[PDB]
Design a protein around this ligand. Structure first.
Ligand SMILES: Nc1ncnc2c1ncn2[C@@H]1O[C@H](COP(=O)(O)OP(=O)(O)O)[C@@H](O)[C@H]1O
Ligand SMILES: Nc1ncnc2c1ncn2[C@@H]1O[C@H](COP(=O)(O)OP(=O)(O)O)[C@@H](O)[C@H]1O
Ligand SMILES: [Mg+2]
Ligand SMILES: [Mg+2]
Ligand SMILES: [Mg+2]
Lengths: 308, 201, 149, 344, 439, 526
């Protein structure tokens, strides 16, 4: 109903009606339109019989209240510790789509996702923003899987290192480049010996930063995207190679919360606060190469897992 | 106005110009004023378009900020000491000058047209000054009365009473644009005829 | 000013205040030095300044401007003076002479007249008065034919 | 459209705007004409309006009927110069008789009844006649509080006419002060004062800045810190300098900084931001104060006085206005117009 | 100072003919040569682009060169042809054929010897000349081939005079000459090391502005000359009118060109839109200035959002108040400052001329130095490389007496030039095989 | 027509017979268009746009409809202008003013057809409105002394206002929300302190008024998600690179280690400012601008909550609720007052997450959550609830009320009728026409419901003439009743504005006799 462009003014309220059920329930988005369609159809006979429309509106509300009490008397309580009931409910809402054949694999996966996000004792609502769906081409439907960790799409900038065991992961929000002040600055040269000083002093400043990072035992580094100043210079990447540090660059700003939630790291914004207390631990970090589609990254085996 | 309301002023009269905030708290009539004609822009601004300031410490910074004000207040104090009451300049006059000229009961005017200034010099008997360092008693203009009056919805400045005048000014009253334009074309025929008759009667 | 780009640089309070006074004093001496030799009229082939104009009026110096690069050269011949490329006090040899200079009007037009009382002079001018532009040009062609003869 | 029982016209603009009016000059101004003689009547109406302001529609009727009577004379064989000369002679005889039957009445603040009667006659032709007794009172009082008797001159730039929609037409009132379309800068300032001493300023509440092109060089950390201290100190001195003079409220022509706005509130001092040019010169005349361009030049002899300054709030809208009232003798005054339509 | 203007080929002659036309009608000059103005402000600097002959006549300082009489006869017979100097017309008898080799080796060699004599006679009449101006197109053989030869000869003759040029950039979407890329690559190679700066203009944006924005569904070349002639006037406008700061062409080089090799600009002209929009758009300062950073007023195929500007210059024409110009400039400088310079802040150069260009209410002119120009030069090289592999149409060039090595030589510089612009962005630095093993 | 032309091409003139024809056609056209939305049983219209990208809305308000319609008749633009002003003045009666202002002109055209000069009608009506407004004033009843009685009046006024809208399905539920919301303002007419949040989903009956406050913002990363016994500091200052040092300074150094020294001095400036903030002993921080990621971790290490980008409205509302001060420069901790709420947590409504403030100190502001099925219901519910809040705020300012349901109109219509029976001349005819127009408003209400309007109005006319000055219509059964018993009540200010504004427009239109149009501008878009 959204993709089609309906033009009748009274046909443009049905598209909003189906979006209402989607928000509150997420299912029955077709059935609610059918019910609303037949109620309006049955109204054309009453208006011919001489019923004023005001009478019709009041009478339907009378019937709606009776409808609620019949359904409630028909229902049955369900306890969250009963796994079998959840599977039967999930597979029933799933066998009406194209993946009805693969419901024998997806249905136990869907329930597992919900049970690993909430606490059944005090569960009053579920937020689906802590569950992320990643779409990747290649293969068939039968190759889907559930990852109890973090999956990153971007490849690694480092050239040579693609697998780390007993990794210590650290997150950075500052920039590894030449020094840069917000005030419009400039370096003035008036003597020939100054040229050699600038080259030497720049290399030392970048070198100092990397020595601090390696001092804490960091194996995997995550940078954050910046668009006003460079985030990873060629000189910086060369040194990080010699110290055997896996580097991942250009992490989005809008999923920093999700990353910290999953692995338990702590964002840092100053080199002076990069200590060993801000690092997360993972049993395995490796990027995997899909057959032909492209390269993918996986982080599995978190010691301090979140509810994602 | 009617056609018989036309008048001749044995002096100089011109239109009111654009004035800044504070023009309205200063007197609009004098009896024996001294007129100081200028060609100098009396407003706070930058000295030269080719200038540039480089400074290291905030102590000089505050000294530089007070330097521009001390320049402006020096010129305005130089004019006020000459005893002049009416000041006219072809260049703009800032609001700071007008408010300053208001606090001492003296009249200011800026962006005066060039032609109206030359007639004022010829009628009052002064001289245009591009600097404020040599305002002798001779470079000032003396008139017998100054006033600002309303004429047909506009405001006009009048300099009347000069006994050594060499200039007149006509104020023509019509009812429509083409009524006074045709009036002035007939006046021009009378002016030229008299000019020729002087040389040969 | 310098032909190469030149800006004024100030670093202290005194230099900011004393720049404007210094420039005016220098201009006064230059014009007074010119008037010391006895010049009565100054003719230039370019733009004039307001401060120079104000001081020229103070020292009773008549000032005219005309930029043709061909009228000025003719004027050099007429009075016998020689051109100068820099604003310097002219040498007694370099100053021309003329028996009268005045501003006059002829037939609704303002003109400037450099008149010699000398019969010969260096060059001469013929003033044409007519009732139509077409009438003058044909008479102008006749004057050329008479001169070429 | 002549006389008290006259009717009006509804003009329509180039873009679609609607204007209902009865003034003679405006109808001929908003009208678009092509005939050259028609434009001559338009210019005739405007000339009378500038000189007098009343009698714009009467003159064109007199002028029109003066031409109509000449059609018969032209046909009967009279040179129009004879007609034009005759009209001139008649006008001279009519005018000399006109001031033979005149009656000098009065000009004095004591009585004001003859002036009200004259004001009533002119308003009797408009839609304002519904309450023209009240409106006559407002008009006469407004002139006599700005009128200079010795020079025999009044200045309309000292009378501000401002109208806001809503309310009722009878809510029109005369305010012997100033009304501005602004409010207090900080939302938590008090909404009224009762012994206001007015401090009028022209410079903004920001650290100084020379106008000539300039550069400041920071070459070390101590230079950086000395600059940081100079910033925050400069914010303090302006507000201290205001308070020692005894001022109660601050009026400024430019904006305030975030730091300077809060410090004013912390020192119990209401202020107004981004006021207009002509408004400032009116407040200076109204409250009797003076305008200062620098904090340093502020003294206790330059403050004005004001009996009451308040923020008045209208109905559903967010529009708020500030009013300055109850001063001493004032040469400035404003007219406030209300009504249920923009056309009123 | 004194400047000389030289035009060659098809495109160069047309623009120059209009340029002298949109100069005479300002300064009070007429198609006979007299001066009929009453304002002395026009005649103060009248001699920078003109010579005065006895009798009050004025003549332009222009040299017209083409290898075929057809174009020169059109200008001579057409409007304003009686104004020009009689001997300044230099013409051949056979044309160039758009073979860059023919115009660079065979025909241009025997013509420059006679043209170089003329420019000497023009340079002898000036007390102190300051530089030259060249107008040519990069597609025709004479514009590229003879244009390259002329510049090389000029440099050897004249040691340190400035070399300003106005060259149109080819738009390959409008490919025209099947062999377009050969002509463009070689001339740019020579231009890089022998000119101070070049002002590029493409016919694409020349096509778009009139057609889409204004009107005339079928705009012919005649209108295209007017649009570029509007831009001719402005970069050059300050020079012919006085100002508070004497802005000469030499200080333009130092103040606009930070690096001697990255010296290619693209100009801008705001006040020209739809005829109805010419009336109903409230042509105030900030909306008029808003056209400087727009995606429509540009006349080059280089996206700025995917680039970083180096230096900007703003020229204003008209009699305004001083305040509002700076106020909006202060606003605009910080409004879209996010997409601004990398390390050269406060680039804005402000110039104001009282008398606007004749015809309209308001006018300005903008110059910008972009890092997106490489997007244009890259595409030229990519098309060039695809053709050189097949050696297509190569005999028409090699067979005229030029070694094949030159085609490979010129390619190297184009890759070198592109690498230079790429280096100053630091954003474009951001794999199919499976080799990701131990080290 | 004179043979000589005086107007440019495209300009047109209309005169007496044609001018008064056009002006009356336009007025009755707009009056009859909106009569269907009047009274407790009026219906709603659909507005769909050809220009604004096919926008669609369903409304009953008489002012929203007249704003969107593209009228072009000169006389119809006068009617639209009064309705917009009336909405901005008292917020109700937009439909009643335009119908009444149109019914006066309908009777005015008949009088002209009987050869009565227009000035005679206006002078006649001027006496009629004076006696009409005076009779209304004598009908006013003024409470306010008793809280219990005044509380009842507010429920009666809100109940009547919601009748004609979509909220009438749940009038009992929505009357309590509207009344209790206005009692929070403590007499200050700052309606902007009430934030109506509308989000799609669920039934219309799930709407409620929150006991505390709600903010639709997000807290910083790695900070406490919930705090008990919070102390709130409200600030308006810069924290994302606060180093906007107003001067035009610049850095000029001859090395690189100097730059790295100055860069470190930048962070020391931000760190020092954060310490001065924490000196106030706060545990919750609210700012109206952005917060950079460096000061974000400073609060994250200190265990504080930081809210960012809460605009001017979001900050001023929090000040009233918690009583804190919007502070800056953080140099004197003693002079700044903090807020206090009992609990702060995150709640989920629909899908989104909002910050919940509970147990606030003052509570002089509030938030209202609206629920519904379609965007048309949510917009209609919010617009309907705006009418109730405004008219209640006027009642608190001036607590005198007048009965409604047609009881008010019939009273004033009788007072003019008594006057017209003593006045001789043609003015007597005009005054009677005024009574015919006022009595149409009760008639129109009865027509929309399907009742015999002529019979019911006839009974009202007799009842009001014999002294039963509280008689009026009863919609639920279509008979007559007492308003003192049933409780239909309006505001004195609202009815006064409806009467005075309507009578004026029929005056300004009626004096017009000549219509002139300038030649319109042609469409040549950019
Ligand atoms: N195995 C089944 N047998 C019978 N009915 C089924 C079965 N599975 C699903 N349904 C019916 O399908 C209906 C809706 O399915 P669906 O196509 O998802 O529509 P909606 O979008 O309204 O949920 C439900 O009413 C349910 O009763
Ligand atoms: N329950 C009721 N019984 C009788 N009259 C009512 C009732 N509710 C509302 N009304 C009347 O409906 C009239 C129209 O009000 P409304 O429909 O809101 O349009 P408006 O925009 O003019 O207020 C009011 O005069 C009011 O007296
Ligand atoms: Mg389903
Ligand atoms: Mg009148
Ligand atoms: Mg209502």
């Amino acid at each position: 109903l959204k993709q089609m462009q309906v033009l009748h003014p009274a046909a443009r309220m049905l598209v909003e009606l189906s979006k209402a059920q989607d928000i509150e329930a997420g299912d029955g988005t077709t059935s609610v339109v059918i019910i609303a369609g037949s109620l309006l159809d049955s109204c054309t006979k009453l208006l011919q019989k001489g019923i004023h429309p005001t009478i019709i509106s009041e009478s339907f509300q009378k019937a709606l209240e009776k409808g609620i009490e019949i359904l409630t008397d028909m229902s049955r309580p369900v306890e969250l510790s009963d796994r079998e009931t959840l599977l039967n409910s999930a597979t029933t809402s799933l066998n009406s789509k194209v993946v009805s054949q693969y419901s024998s694999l997806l249905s136990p996966m869907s329930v597992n996702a919900v049970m690993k996000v909430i606490d059944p004792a005090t569960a009053t609502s579920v937020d689906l923003r802590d569950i992320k769906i990643v779409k990747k081409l290649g293969g068939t439907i039968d190759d889907c899987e559930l990852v109890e960790g973090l999956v990153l799409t971007q490849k690694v900038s480092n050239s040579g290192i693609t697998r780390v065991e007993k990794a210590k992961i650290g997150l950075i929000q500052f920039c590894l480049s030449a020094p840069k002040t917000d005030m419009d600055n400039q370096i003035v040269v008036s003597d020939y010996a100054q040229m050699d000083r600038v080259l030497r002093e720049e290399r030392a400043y970048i070198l100092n930063l990397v020595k601090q990072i390696k001092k804490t035992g960091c194996n995997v580094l995550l940078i954050q995207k910046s668009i006003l100043r460079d985030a990873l210079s060629d000189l910086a990447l060369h040194f990080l190679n010699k110290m055997k540090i896996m580097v991942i660059k250009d992490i989005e700003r809008e999923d920093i919360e999700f990353i910290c939630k999953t692995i338990g790291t702590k964002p840092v914004a100053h080199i002076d606060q990069f200590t060993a207390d801000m690092l997360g631990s993972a049993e395995l970090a490796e990027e995997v190469n899909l057959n032909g589609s492209g390269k993918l990254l996986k982080i599995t085996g978190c010691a301090s897992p979140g509810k994602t | 106005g009617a056609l018989e309301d036309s008048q001749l002023v044995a002096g100089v009269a011109f239109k009111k110009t654009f004035s800044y905030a504070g023009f309205e708290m200063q007197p609009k009539k004098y009896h024996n004023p001294k007129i100081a004609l200028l060609n100098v822009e009396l407003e706070l601004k930058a000295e030269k378009d080719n200038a540039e300031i480089r400074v290291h410490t905030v102590e000089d910074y505050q000294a530089i900020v007070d330097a521009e004000w001390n320049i402006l207040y020096d010129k305005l104090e130089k004019i006020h000491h000459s005893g002049a009451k009416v000041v006219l300049s072809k260049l703009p006059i800032g609001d700071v000058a007008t408010q300053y000229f208001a606090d001492r009961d003296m009249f200011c005017a800026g962006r005066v047209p060039e032609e109206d200034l030359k007639r004022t010099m010829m009628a009052c008997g002064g001289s245009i000054q591009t600097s404020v360092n040599a305002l002798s008693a001779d470079v000032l203009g003396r008139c017998q009365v100054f006033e600002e009056t309303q004429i047909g919805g506009e405001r006009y400045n009048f300099f009347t009473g000069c006994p050594k005048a060499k200039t007149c000014t006509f104020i023509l009253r019509g009812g429509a644009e083409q009524f006074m334009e045709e009036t002035e074309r007939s006046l021009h025929d009378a002016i030229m005829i008299v000019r020729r008759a002087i040389k040969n009667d | 000013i310098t032909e190469t780009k030149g800006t004024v640089l100030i670093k202290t309070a005194e230099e900011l205040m004393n720049f404007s006074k210094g420039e005016e004093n220098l201009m006064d001496a230059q014009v007074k030095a010119i008037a010391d030799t006895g010049a009565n009229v100054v003719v230039t082939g370019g733009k004039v300044a307001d401060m120079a104009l104000h001081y020229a009026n103070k020292y009773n110096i008549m000032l005219v401007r005309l930029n043709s690069k061909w009228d000025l050269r003719r004027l050099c011949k007429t009075v016998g003076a020689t051109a100068l490329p820099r604003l310097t006090p002219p040498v007694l040899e370099e100053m021309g002479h003329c028996d009268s200079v005045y501003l006059s009007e002829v037939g609704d037009t303002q003109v400037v007249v450099f008149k010699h009382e000398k019969e010969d002079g260096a060059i001469s001018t013929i003033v044409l008065r007519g009732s139509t532009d077409n009438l003058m040009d044909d008479i102008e062609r006749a004057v050329d034919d008479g001169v070429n003869t | 459209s002549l006389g008290p029982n006259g009717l009006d016209k509804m003009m329509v603009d180039k873009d679609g705007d609607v204007t209902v009016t009865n003034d003679g000059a405006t109808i001929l101004s908003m009208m678009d004409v092509d005939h050259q003689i028609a434009k001559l009547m338009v210019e005739l109406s405007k000339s009378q309006d500038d000189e007098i302001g009343d009698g714009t529609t009467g003159v064109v009727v007199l002028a029109g009927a003066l031409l109509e009577e000449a059609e018969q004379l032209l046909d009967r064989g009279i040179h129009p110069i004879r007609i034009a000369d005759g009209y001139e002679q008649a006008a001279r005889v009519a005018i000399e008789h006109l001031d033979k039957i005149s009656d000098s009445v009065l000009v004095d603040i004591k009585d004001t009844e003859p002036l009200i009667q004259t004001a009533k006659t002119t308003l009797g032709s408009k839609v304002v006649n519904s309450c023209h007794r009240q409106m006559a009172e407002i008009a006469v009082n407004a002139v006599l509080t700005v009128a200079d008797m010795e020079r025999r001159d009044v200045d309309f730039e000292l009378i501000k006419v401002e109208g806001k929609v809503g309310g009722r037409l009878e809510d029109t009132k005369l305010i012997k002060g100033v009304i501005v379309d602004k409010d207090f800068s900080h939302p938590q300032m008090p909404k009224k004062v009762e012994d206001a001493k007015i401090a009028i300023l022209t410079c903004p509440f920001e650290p100084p800045k020379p106008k000539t092109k300039h550069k400041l060089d920071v070459t070390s950390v101590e230079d950086y810190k000395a600059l940081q201290k100079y910033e925050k100190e400069k914010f303090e001195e302006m507000i201290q300098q205001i308070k020692e003079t005894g001022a109660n409220l601050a009026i400024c022509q430019w904006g305030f900084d975030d730091e300077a706005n809060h410090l004013l509130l912390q020192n119990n001092l209401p202020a107004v931001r981004w006021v207009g040019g002509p408004e400032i010169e009116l407040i200076a005349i109204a409250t009797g104060g003076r305008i200062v361009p620098r904090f340093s030049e502020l003294t206790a002899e330059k403050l004005g006085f004001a009996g009451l300054v308040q923020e008045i709030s209208f109905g559903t809208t967010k529009d708020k206005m500030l009013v300055i009232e109850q001063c001493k003798n004032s040469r400035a005054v404003t007219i406030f117009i209300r009504g249920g339509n923009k056309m009123i | 100072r004194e400047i000389v203007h030289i035009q060659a080929g098809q495109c160069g002659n047309q623009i120059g003919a209009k340029f002298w036309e949109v100069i005479s009608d300002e300064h009070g000059i007429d198609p006979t040569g007299t001066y009929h103005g009453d304002s002395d402000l026009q005649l103060d600097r009248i001699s920078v682009y003109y010579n005065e002959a006895t009798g009050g006549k004025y003549v332009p300082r222009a040299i017209l060169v083409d290898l075929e009489p057809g174009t020169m006869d059109s200008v001579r017979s057409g409007p304003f042809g009686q104004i020009f100097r009689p001997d300044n017309f230099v013409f051949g008898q056979s044309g160039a054929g758009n073979n860059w080799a023919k115009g660079h080796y065979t025909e241009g060699a025997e013509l420059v010897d006679s043209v170089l004599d003329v420019v000497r006679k023009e340079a002898e009449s000036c007390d102190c000349l300051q530089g030259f101006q060249l107008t040519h197109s990069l597609g025709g053989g004479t514009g590229s081939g003879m244009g390259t030869l002329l510049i090389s000869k000029i440099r050897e003759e004249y040691p340190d005079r400035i070399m300003n040029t106005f060259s149109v950039v080819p738009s390959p979407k409008v490919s025209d000459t099947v062999v377009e890329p050969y002509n463009a690559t070689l001339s740019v190679h020579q231009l890089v090391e022998n000119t101070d700066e070049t002002y590029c203009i493409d016919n694409e944006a020349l096509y778009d502005i009139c057609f889409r924005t204004l009107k005339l569904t079928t705009p012919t070349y005649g209108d295209l000359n007017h649009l570029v002639s509007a831009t001719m006037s402005g970069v050059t406008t300050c020079l012919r009118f006085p100002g508070q700061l004497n802005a000469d062409l030499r200080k333009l080089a130092v103040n606009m060109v930070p690096f001697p090799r990255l010296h290619f600009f693209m100009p801008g002209f705001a006040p020209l839109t739809s005829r109805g929009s010419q009336q109903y758009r409230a042509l105030t300062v900030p909306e008029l200035t808003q056209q400087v950073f727009d995606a429509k007023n540009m006349m080059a195929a280089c996206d700025p959002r995917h680039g970083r500007y180096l230096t900007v210059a703003a020229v204003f024409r008209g009699r305004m108040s001083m305040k509002e110009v700076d106020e909006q400039m202060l606003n605009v400088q910080n409004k879209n400052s996010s997409y601004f310079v990398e390390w050269i802040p406060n680039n804005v150069k402000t110039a104001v001329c009282d008398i606007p260009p004749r015809g309209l209410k308001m006018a300005v002119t903008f110059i910008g130095n972009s890092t997106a120009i490489q997007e244009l030069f890259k595409r030229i090289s990519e098309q060039f490389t695809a053709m050189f592999r097949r050696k297509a149409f190569l005999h028409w060039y090699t067979g005229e007496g030029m070694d094949e090595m030159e085609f490979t030589e010129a390619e190297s510089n184009m890759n070198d030039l592109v690498s230079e612009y790429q280096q100053y962005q630091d954003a474009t630095a951001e794999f199919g095989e499976e080799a990701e093993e131990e080290a | 027509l004179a043979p000589v032309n005086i107007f440019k091409a495209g300009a047109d003139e209309e005169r007496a017979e044609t001018a008064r024809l056009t002006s009356f056609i336009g007025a009755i056209a707009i009056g009859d268009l909106v009569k269907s939305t009047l009274g407790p049983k009026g219906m709603d219209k659909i507005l769909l746009s050809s220009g604004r990208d096919a926008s669609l809305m369903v409304t009953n308000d008489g002012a929203t409809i007249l704003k969107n319609i593209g009228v072009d008749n000169p006389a119809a633009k006068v009617l639209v202008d009064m309705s917009r002003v009336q909405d901005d003045e008292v917020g109700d009666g937009t439909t009643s003013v335009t119908v009444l202002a149109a019914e006066l002109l309908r009777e005015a055209e008949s009088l002209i057809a009987k050869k009565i000069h227009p000035q005679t009608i206006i002078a006649g009506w001027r006496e009629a409105t004076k006696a009409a407004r005076e009779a209304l004033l004598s009908s006013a009843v003024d409470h306010g002394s008793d809280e219990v009685k005044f509380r009842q009046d507010l429920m009666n006024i809100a109940g009547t206002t919601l009748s004609s809208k979509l909220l009438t399905h749940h009038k009992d539920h929505f009357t309590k929300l509207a009344v209790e919301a206005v009692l929070r303002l403590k007499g200050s007419g700052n309606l902007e302190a009430i934030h109506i949040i509308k989000k799609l989903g669920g039934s219309l009956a799930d709407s409620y008024l929150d006991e505390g406050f709600l903010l639709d913002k997000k807290i910083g990363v790695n900070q406490p998600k919930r705090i008990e016994n919070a102390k709130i500091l409200i600030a308006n200052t810069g924290m994302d690179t606060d180093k906007i040092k107003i001067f035009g300074s610049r850095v000029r150094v001859d090395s690189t280690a100097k730059v790295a020294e100055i860069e470190h001095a930048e962070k020391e400036k931000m760190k020092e400012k954060v310490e001065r903030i924490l000196k106030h002993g706060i545990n919750c921080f609210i700012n109206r601008q952005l917060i950079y990621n460096y000061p974000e971790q400073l609060f994250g290490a200190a265990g504080v909550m930081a809210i960012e980008h809460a605009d001017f409205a979001g900050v001023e509302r929090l000040a009233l609720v918690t009583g804190g001060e919007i502070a800056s420069t953080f140099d004197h901790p003693e002079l700044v007052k903090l807020g206090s709420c009992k609990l702060i947590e995150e709640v989920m409504i629909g899908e989104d997450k909002l910050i919940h403030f509970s147990g606030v100190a003052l509570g002089e502001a509030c938030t209202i959550v609206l629920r519904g099925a379609t965007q048309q219901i949510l917009d209609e519910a919010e617009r309907s609830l705006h009418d109730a809040l405004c008219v209640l705020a006027q009642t608190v300012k001036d607590s005198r009320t007048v009965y409604g349901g047609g009881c008010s109109e019939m009273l004033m219509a009788h007072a003019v009728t008594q006057l017209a029976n003593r006045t001789p001349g043609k003015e007597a005819v005009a005054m009677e026409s005024y009574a015919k127009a006022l009595r149409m408003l009760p008639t129109i209400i009865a027509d929309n419901a399907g009742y015999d309007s002529a019979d019911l109005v006839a009974q009202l006319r007799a009842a009001h003439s014999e002294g039963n000055t509280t008689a009026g219509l009863d919609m639920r059964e279509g008979t007559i009743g007492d308003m003192a018993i049933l409780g239909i009540t309006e505001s004195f200010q609202v009815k006064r504005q409806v009467l005075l504004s309507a009578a004026e427009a029929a005056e300004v239109i009626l004096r017009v006799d000549n219509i002139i149009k300038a030649a319109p501008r042609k469409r040549v878009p950019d």
